[PDB]
């Protein structure tokens, strides 16, 4: 569905300007509620907390077809120099700053010590800080040629603890979806920092579910004190 179709369906479902009591929204309010419904729905889908679906990020074909258009791949070889880490062999990499959740995360290694295995792809294991001390020396869950520990730190950074030098850092995350903005908003206004029209980038399959959730949010907004 397009922005015009989004607005028209929103009005039709809300029974705007009908004879019965009803609710009429501005295009800014329609955009706000559509964006809120979109982001709520995709977060609930990713966490598997939607009772209707009850499935996780890629647990079935339906959810794949829903959130296929947020999956973005990223590559980086630059390392942030001045930072204080929890180990000597700690390197820091920037995050794209539009990430929502990291779903695939792997690290290529370039070191002489692992001879004839150079350029080995290594599995970045997100490790909590409780386990870090007892995982540094762990030969089965600690850093090694086939495994790297990533700890999240401030300023959108990723502290990669490896026994070998880390050359490249690969990611595949869920991106910020573009907001659903149905009209070029006036000066000052914006949704997610976007002022112009913005079409939903997901598939049309989930557009109608987003519309239903946005409508429900609208009625909740108008009918939370009565």
């Amino acid at each position: 569905m397009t922005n015009k179709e989004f607005s028209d369906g929103f009005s039709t479902l809300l029974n705007s300007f009908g004879i019965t009591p009803n609710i009429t929204l501005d295009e800014y309010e329609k955009s706000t509620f559509l964006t809120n419904a979109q982001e709520q729905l995709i977060i609930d889908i990713y966490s598997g907390r939607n009772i209707i679906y009850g499935k996780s990020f890629e647990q079935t074909e339906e959810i794949r077809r829903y959130l296929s258009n947020l999956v973005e791949t990223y590559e980086t070889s630059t390392k942030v120099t001045g930072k204080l880490g929890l180990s000597k062999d700690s390197v820091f990499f920037e995050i794209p700053q539009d990430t929502w959740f990291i779903t695939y995360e792997v690290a290529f290694l370039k070191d002489s010590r692992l001879g004839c295995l150079d350029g080995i792809e290594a599995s970045v294991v997100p490790l909590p800080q409780d386990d870090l001390y007892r995982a540094k020396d762990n030969p089965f869950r600690g850093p090694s040629k086939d495994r790297v520990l990533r700890l999240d730190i401030k300023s959108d950074l990723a502290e990669l603890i490896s026994k070998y030098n880390v050359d490249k850092y690969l990611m595949r995350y869920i991106s910020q979806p573009t907001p659903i903005i149905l009209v070029d908003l006036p000066d000052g206004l914006s949704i997610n920092g976007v002022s112009t029209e913005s079409e939903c980038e997901l598939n049309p399959v989930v557009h109608r579910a987003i519309l239903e959730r946005a409508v429900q949010l609208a009625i909740i907004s108008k009918t939370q004190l009565t």
């Binding site: 800014y28 070029d184 006036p186």
Partner: protein, 238 residues
């Protein structure tokens, strides 16, 4: 029924049957009372509370057919002829037709399609400009009356990045006076609303009897002349 029939039946209903007959009315007086009755009937019938039935402009077939001959459609002229101070920075000033009595429907044709104009009140203006958006809904536009001289000037507020192509106004034309005879005189030309020539009732014949009855009632109230009659029959001026 033409002006001659108004005057003749006015005499018949006023003083040709009454027992202790009163002095007959001059044609200027009859024309005055007929015009006043015309405006009074129009104002009574436009507002539901103004008449005994509780029915307004379009609340029954009779009320439709009453104003059928008084409805007119025109266009507002863009008021870029001279500079002016608009209350709202993003409002385009338009001038309504001179012969305007009441506005019942307005519409504006923009590049984004036709949009119905909603006349927003001053309290609704204050409420709506307190919200973050400050623009109309999708298929409507907003309107407020601005500095008007000799004719109504109107401020149209549309959504951003929209240009107005035309501004049609379905209004009720100002009724023309009912004048029985050429009021030209050597002693001085008298006029009802600026016209001394004969002027027929330009409304449907369905309400000609109604206007005549109201004229007779006003004539007899003036004849009585006490404060009571004037006060109770002024309640229907509205």
């Amino acid at each position: 029924m033409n002006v001659n029939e108004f005057s003749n039946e006015f005499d018949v209903l006023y003083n040709n049957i009454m027992s202790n007959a009163a002095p007959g009315l001059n044609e200027y007086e009859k024309s005055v009372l007929l015009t006043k009755a015309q405006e009074e009937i129009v104002k009574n019938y436009f507002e539901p509370a103004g008449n005994k039935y509780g029915k307004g402009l379009d609340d029954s077939p009779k009320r439709q057919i009453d104003f059928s001959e008084l409805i007119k459609v025109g266009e507002g002229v863009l008021n870029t002829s001279a500079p002016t101070i608009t209350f709202d920075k993003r409002a385009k000033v338009y001038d309504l037709p001179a012969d305007l009595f009441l506005v019942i429907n307005e519409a504006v044709d923009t590049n984004a399609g036709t949009k119905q104009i909603v006349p927003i009140s001053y309290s609704d203006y204050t409420r709506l400009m307190s919200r973050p958006y400050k623009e109309p809904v999708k298929y409507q536009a907003w309107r407020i009356i601005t500095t008007s001289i000799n004719n109504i000037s109107v401020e149209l507020i549309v959504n951003s990045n929209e240009t107005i192509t035309d501004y049609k106004v379905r209004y009720i034309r100002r009724p023309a006076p009912i004048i029985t005879t050429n009021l030209s005189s050597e002693y001085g030309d008298v006029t009802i609303n600026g016209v001394s020539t004969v002027s027929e009732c330009e409304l449907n014949p369905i309400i000609h009897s109604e206007i005549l009855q109201r004229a007779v009632e006003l004539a007899k109230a003036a004849y009585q002349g006490d404060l009571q009659a004037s006060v109770e029959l002024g309640q229907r001026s509205e």
